[PDB]
C-alpha cells in the first residue's frame, strides 16, 4: 500500500559440491561487493557465534548444518562487534550509510523503519536455513511454476499503478504553480 | 453458514479433496461394464469435496459435448474455433 519498491536479496552459498571451505555471502542494495553472513548479523546486533548460529539452525542435534556454517564462523572471525561490522560495508560517514542501508534497503518488506533488526536477523537466518536445507539435499529446489506463488494483476491493480503516477505528476504541478507564485 | 469455502493453490496443498459427494464417501461391502473405470475412495482423511469436476474448465471448453470422450488436442482446437463462430452475440 506504500509505493512499488522492489529490491532482491540473494544469499549465495559459494564453494561447489565437493569443494572444501563452502562460505555463505549476501548481496546488499548499493553495496559494491558480497558480505559474509556473520558480518551481516554482527552489523545488526547479533555478536556471539552461538547466537548467530541460533538464528540459522533451529535444532541443536543438527551437527550437519552446524558443520556447514563452521567456515562462516571463520570467514568473519576478524570482526567481533557491530561498529567494525557496519564499518566493513563501504569517514565514519560510511558506517551511517551502512546503518541506513540495513534499515531502508535490506528487507524493506517486514520494515523500512529503525527499531527492529531482531526481526530482520531472524528472517535472514530463516533464509540461510532454507538455503542449507536444500544444499544438504534434504529439500527440493523451489518450483518457480507453482501457481500459488503467482498473482494476477487485474483492472483495479493496473489502474492504481497509473493513478499513483498521474496523481503524483498533478501533485508536482500544483507545487510548481505554488513556487511560481512569488507575488 | 460455513458449508462451502474459498481455497487457493497454496491452501490446496494442505487439504484432501473428494471428487464426488456420494461416489467418494458412503461406505463399503454386479456393475455396469459400459460405465467408465473409477478407482476407490482409499484415502478417507478428507477435508473438502469438489463442487463439480467439470468446473475445472472455462467458457470455451464448457461448450464441448463429452470432452471426456475426446483426444486432448481436439478440445484445445475446438476452444480456439468457437471464437470464429457466428450467432446472436447480443439482443441489441
Amino acid at each position: 500500500k506504500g509505493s512499488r519498491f522492489i529490491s532482491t536479496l540473494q544469499v549465495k552459498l559459494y564453494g561447489r559440491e565437493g569443494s572444501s571451505a563452502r562460505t555463505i555471502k549476501a548481496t546488499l542494495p548499493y553495496i559494491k561487493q558480497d558480505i559474509p553472513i556473520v558480518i551481516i548479523f554482527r552489523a545488526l546486533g547479533i555478536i556471539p557465534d552461538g547466537e548467530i548460529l541460533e538464528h540459522i539452525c533451529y535444532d541443536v542435534n543438527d551437527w550437519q548444518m552446524l558443520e556447514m556454517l563452521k567456515p562462516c564462523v571463520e570467514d568473519g572471525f576478524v570482526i567481533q562487534d557491530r561498529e567494525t561490522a557496519l564499518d566493513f560495508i563501504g569517514k565514519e560517514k560510511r558506517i551511517q550509510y551502512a546503518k541506513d542501508i540495513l534499515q531502508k534497503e535490506f528487507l524493506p518488506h517486514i520494515t523500512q523503519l529503525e527499531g527492529f533488526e531482531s526481526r530482520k536477523a531472524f528472517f535472514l537466518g530463516y533464509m540461510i536455513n532454507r538455503l542449507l536445507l536444500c544444499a544438504l539435499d534434504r529439500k527440493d529446489q523451489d518450483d518457480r511454476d507453482h501457481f500459488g506463488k503467482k498473482r494476477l494483476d487485474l483492472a483495479g491493480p493496473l489502474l492504481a499503478q497509473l493513478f499513483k503516477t498521474l496523481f503524483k505528476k498533478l501533485t508536482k504541478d500544483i507545487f510548481r504553480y505554488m513556487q511560481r507564485t512569488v507575488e | 453458514e460455513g458449508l462451502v469455502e474459498y481455497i487457493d493453490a497454496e491452501e490446496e496443498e494442505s487439504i484432501l479433496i473428494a471428487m464426488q459427494p456420494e461416489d467418494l464417501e458412503p461406505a463399503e461391502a454386479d456393475v455396469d461394464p459400459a460405465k467408465r473405470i473409477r478407482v476407490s475412495h482409499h484415502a478417507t482423511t478428507f477435508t473438502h469435496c469438489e463442487i463439480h469436476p467439470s468446473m475445472i474448465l472455462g467458457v470455451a471448453a464448457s461448450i464441448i459435448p463429452f470432452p471426456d470422450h475426446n483426444q486432448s488436442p481436439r478440445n484445445t482446437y475446438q476452444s480456439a474455433m468457437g471464437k470464429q463462430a457466428m450467432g446472436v452475440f447480443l439482443t441489441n
Binding site: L154, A155 | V4, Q20, P21, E22, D23, I51, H52, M55, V59
Partner: peptide, 30 residues
Amino acid sequence: DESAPITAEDSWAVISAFFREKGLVSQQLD
C-alpha cells in the same frame, strides 16, 4: 430429511447459487 446428505445432482443448485450472485465476470467487477 433436512439432515440427509447431498447427491451429485444437488451440486448444480450450489453452482446455480454461485452464478446467481457472482455472474460470470466477477473478477473484473470485484
